[PDB]
């Protein structure tokens, strides 16, 4: 007895059928009523034609692309009888191309990233954000369309929101629940937070040991090993004393970010989640560490920035991915082959994803999910728990979309964090928080000297590996 | 057809630790010696290992070998007769020199694998500057072999083998040196900038990675020991840049410089020919001061003018890179550890040479690529990692029986072709191979570097920063 939330009374467009695409289609078909027939995938690969073959989808064999992404979407749109919904699920296409022909056509929109079609200050994922709230601005209201609604970017902006609510509890703060941006901001800013680590670790492992001159991952390798080698980015706090000589900012934008010249996936922090404790994570580029700490900054009269938390991805991927990225970095080139592992190529683990709130007075805060391969397969065919985690915000954002759909551009941290969470909650497995005394400063200085700042623990200082 | 017996050993053989190398070592000193099996004993504090030793039907002493026992437990030992005595030092925990003189001062050959205490000052220059200290106190008297398993040991003999391959590849023939000073100028002449002991673990497991264990193809303590110390390196004449915390030595043969920062976090770029280009973690070892130092000369006031670059660039089995990344990650030991068996491993090779470069045909690999199939079928109780060293402690004993009254030695010091000759039926594939990889193979990148184009093997390069 699944939910079904609503009617879709337009085209399903899913734009590209990898591992997300298989695993967010049959949420689709099980959460949502529609004209069977008028669902469509487009994906260049053959592997994708014949798993879409076998579930009877309309299957375009093409590859999106600049020259040709109007004339192939614009007829499949608008083919009616109602309003129609693209699920951007690719890569290699321009999410705001897509998204913007999917708006002045009247379709709504939703994708997990924003990417360009196939200097380090342009390319990041600072500007590329800052290209879609210009377009927003650019065109207020309107049909909605959903920018980065996956599980990191997107369901961790509505982590942030219950933490922050676990944390005024706890922490003896008073006032009504924050319903605007401006509220949120400065809850945090009473709270403390001085920053948020998205802090994952992924423990699903495979049944077949690490193959050489194979990357290994459990989602899109191409996505994250072109994330991965895209300078590192975060958020950066208003608490902050220090940053690195290699550290660089914008000169124009929401002005919350800053970014490395050295490639994330090979830069290192220290970090903590529950099943791990203190860890390494990788400090890879993301667009929720921007747009995490723009959404919680409170501005003055004259538009300064007084308080904006530190935000950033402390990413430990699975075993083999760990693995792949020392093959791949220590070798100076790709591998020659990669894989995505599948649920049946995985013999036990988790995806731990969460928020890890720190600097207020509880030393810190981790809040998230804790969705295991065994569960996944319980209740939910065709991916692992990463996957899963993707494609039910994904679903979760669908939903939102079509309760609201004139609500223009929107960013993950723009939508009702309760009524999100509530129809993705079913697919997260257990959803805990839990506090930790552990510091940057665990253990340390230990037996060789290091330039630490012993006045205040979580300064990136004391965060980043500095080899 | 059968295997050689190389010698008759006519007193106790006494062998201190049996962990993964001693077990390795056991059966190889049964099969190629001749002695009353009575006359050996293993003396080593562990139950798991007393187990494994009652099975193979030797005597076992169950006790740890400490500075106040181990007068009072190794003379009479070694001493009982009727002839002289081997002494073989596997363990971790005890001190080298301290058996070592025991040992000579009882007329007991001896051998060992690692310079090591009792359970600047704690480096393994410095630890190797006491050996150098007491071989120049007490010259002579009975052979003492310092350091001569895989590496250190092994490679010292390929660093040698490999100078004279490079040589008759060149077209130079009637290249044979005999004294030390002679193999420093071979390098120099052909201007052999720096070695790497380049290695490549490729053993597989059977089970997954488990949480909170540190696995690895031989001794965890020895490793991580080794691995949490500063980097050190022997320091070559052609360097032009050094890290900031980067340090000399103000006595010794001068030939190291050490890092203040841990080896197994310490990256650098290398080669093999079976990983081709990869990262190395940069882990102190004594063969990295020794073989520089021996390859060292010297103008007439005596200051180095020819020296190369030596170090560590190891990439151990998968399972050991997730344990340090793992350690360094939580900032402490894992709460358990063991160690890959034959019987656990799945597949895969140690691909153990070294690596020379610099010269005018760039880079040359030269070393082992035994696989653990090969090792199932030739000896037993060890993975690859393990033949490497027992074989390489068989032929530093063969080597100590036939020159007896040669005085503490390092492998360096030992017949290079004698010491192959017994240890290569254990070393599979011995291959050199040449390659055009230098560490600015795709630099500059994306990203700003520091680096040096005139010089591609400048450690300015190599290392990860
Ligand atoms: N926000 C998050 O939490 C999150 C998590 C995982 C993945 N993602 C993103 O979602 C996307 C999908 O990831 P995945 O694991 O499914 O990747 P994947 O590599 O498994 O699949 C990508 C698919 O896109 C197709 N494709 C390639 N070029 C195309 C084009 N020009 N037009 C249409 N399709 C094309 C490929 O054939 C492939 O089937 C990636 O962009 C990734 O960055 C986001
Ligand atoms: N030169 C090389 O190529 C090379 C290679 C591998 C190992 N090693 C060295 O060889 C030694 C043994 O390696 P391993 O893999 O067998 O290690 P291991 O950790 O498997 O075994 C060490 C053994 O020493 C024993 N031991 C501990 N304290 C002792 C004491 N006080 N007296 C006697 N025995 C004691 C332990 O019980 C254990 O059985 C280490 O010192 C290691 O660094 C050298």
Same mark, same amino acid.
């Given at each position: 007895?699944?939910?079904?939330?609503?009617?879709?009374?337009?085209?399903?467009?899913?734009?590209?059928?990898?591992?997300?695409?298989?695993?967010?289609?049959?949420?689709?078909?099980?959460?949502?009523?529609?004209?069977?027939?008028?669902?469509?995938?487009?994906?260049?690969?053959?592997?994708?034609?014949?798993?879409?073959?076998?579930?009877?989808?309309?299957?375009?064999?093409?590859?999106?692309?600049?020259?040709?992404?109007?004339?192939?979407?614009? /007829?499949?749109?608008?083919?009616?009888?109602?309003?129609?919904?693209?699920?951007?699920?690719?890569?290699?296409?321009?999410?705001?191309?897509?998204?913007?022909?999917?708006?002045? @056509?009247?379709?709504?929109?939703?994708?997990?990233?924003?990417?360009? #079609?196939?200097? /380090?200050?342009?390319?990041?994922?600072?500007?590329?954000?800052?290209?879609?709230?210009?377009?927003?601005?650019?065109?207020?209201?309107?049909?909605?369309?959903?920018?980065?609604?996956? =599980? @990191?970017?997107?369901?961790?902006?509505?982590?942030?929101?219950?933490?922050?609510?676990?944390?005024?509890?706890?922490?003896?703060? %008073?006032?009504?629940?924050?319903?605007?941006?401006?509220?949120? =901001?400065?809850?945090?800013?009473?709270?403390?937070?001085?920053?948020?680590?998205?802090?994952?670790?992924?423990?699903?492992?495979?049944?077949? /040991?690490?193959?050489?001159?194979?990357?290994?991952?459990?989602?899109?390798?191409?996505?994250?090993?072109?994330?991965?080698?895209?300078?590192?980015?975060?958020?950066?706090?208003?608490?902050?004393?220090?940053?690195?000589?290699?550290?660089?900012?914008?000169?124009?934008?929401?002005?919350?970010?800053?970014?490395?010249?050295?490639?994330?996936?090979?830069?290192?922090?220290?970090? #903590?989640?529950?099943?791990?404790?203190?860890?390494?994570?990788?400090?890879?580029?993301?667009?929720?560490?921007?747009?995490? =700490?723009?959404?919680?900054?409170?501005?003055?009269?004259?538009?300064?920035?007084?308080?904006?938390? %530190?935000?950033?991805?402390?990413?430990?991927?699975? @075993?083999?991915?760990?693995?792949?990225?020392?093959?791949?970095?220590?070798?100076?080139?790709?591998?020659?082959?990669?894989?995505?592992?599948?649920?049946?190529?995985?013999?036990?683990?988790?995806?731990?994803?969460?928020?890890?709130?720190?600097?207020?007075?509880?030393?810190?805060? #981790?809040?998230?999910?804790?969705?295991?391969?065994?569960?996944?397969?319980?209740?939910?065919?065709?991916?692992? =728990?990463?996957?899963?985690?993707?494609?039910?915000?994904?679903?979760?954002?669908?939903? #939102?979309?079509?309760?609201?759909?004139?609500?223009?551009?929107?960013?993950?941290?723009?939508?009702?964090?309760?009524?999100?969470?509530?129809?993705?909650?079913?697919?997260?497995?257990?959803?805990?928080?839990?506090?930790?005394?552990?510091?940057?400063?665990?253990?340390? /200085?230990?037996?060789?000297?290091?330039?630490?700042?012993?006045?205040?623990?979580?300064?990136?200082?004391?965060?980043?590996?500095?080899?």
């Amino acid at each position: 007895d699944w939910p079904v939330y609503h009617r879709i009374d337009g085209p399903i467009v899913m734009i590209g059928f990898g591992s997300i695409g298989r695993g967010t289609l049959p949420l689709i078909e099980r959460h949502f009523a529609f004209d069977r027939s008028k669902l469509v995938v487009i994906d260049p690969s053959d592997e994708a034609r014949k798993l879409a073959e076998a579930r009877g989808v309309r299957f375009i064999q093409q590859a999106v692309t600049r020259d040709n992404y109007r004339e192939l979407l614009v /007829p499949l749109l608008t083919a009616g009888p109602g309003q129609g919904f693209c699920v951007n699920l690719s890569v290699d296409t321009s999410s705001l191309d897509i998204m913007e022909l999917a708006r002045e @056509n009247g379709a709504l929109y939703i994708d997990t990233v924003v990417e360009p #079609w196939l200097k /380090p200050e342009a390319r990041s994922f600072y500007a590329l954000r800052e290209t879609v709230l210009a377009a927003r601005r650019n065109k207020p209201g309107g049909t909605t369309a959903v920018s980065c609604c996956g =599980a @990191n970017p997107g369901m961790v902006s509505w982590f942030v929101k219950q933490a922050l609510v676990n944390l005024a509890a706890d922490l003896g703060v %008073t006032g009504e629940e924050p319903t605007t941006r401006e509220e949120w =901001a400065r809850l945090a800013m009473d709270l403390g937070v001085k920053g948020i680590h998205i802090a994952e670790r992924d423990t699903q492992r495979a049944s077949f /040991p690490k193959p050489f001159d194979v990357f290994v991952n459990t989602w899109s390798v191409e996505g994250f090993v072109s994330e991965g080698l895209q300078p590192a980015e975060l958020g950066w706090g208003t608490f902050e004393r220090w940053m690195p000589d290699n550290a660089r900012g914008h000169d124009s934008g929401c002005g919350a970010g800053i970014y490395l010249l050295q490639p994330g996936a090979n830069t290192r922090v220290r970090s #903590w989640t529950p099943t791990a404790m203190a860890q390494y994570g990788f400090l890879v580029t993301h667009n929720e560490s921007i747009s995490i =700490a723009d959404f919680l900054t409170v501005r003055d009269a004259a538009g300064q920035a007084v308080y904006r938390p %530190t935000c950033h991805y402390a990413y430990h991927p699975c @075993n083999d991915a760990v693995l792949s990225l020392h093959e791949m970095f220590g070798s100076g080139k790709r591998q020659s082959d990669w894989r995505i592992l599948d649920e049946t190529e995985i013999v036990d683990g988790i995806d731990e994803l969460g928020v890890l709130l720190y600097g207020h007075g509880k030393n810190a805060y #981790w809040y998230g999910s804790q969705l295991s391969i065994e569960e996944t397969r319980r209740i939910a065919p065709d991916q692992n =728990a990463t996957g899963l985690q993707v494609s039910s915000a994904v679903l979760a954002g669908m939903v #939102w979309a079509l309760e609201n759909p004139n609500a223009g551009i929107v960013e993950a941290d723009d939508l009702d964090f309760r009524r999100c969470l509530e129809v993705q909650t079913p697919y997260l497995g257990p959803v805990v928080g839990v506090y930790t005394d552990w510091t940057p400063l665990a253990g340390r /200085p230990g037996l060789f000297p290091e330039d630490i700042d012993t006045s205040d623990p979580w300064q990136f200082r004391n965060v980043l590996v500095r080899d």
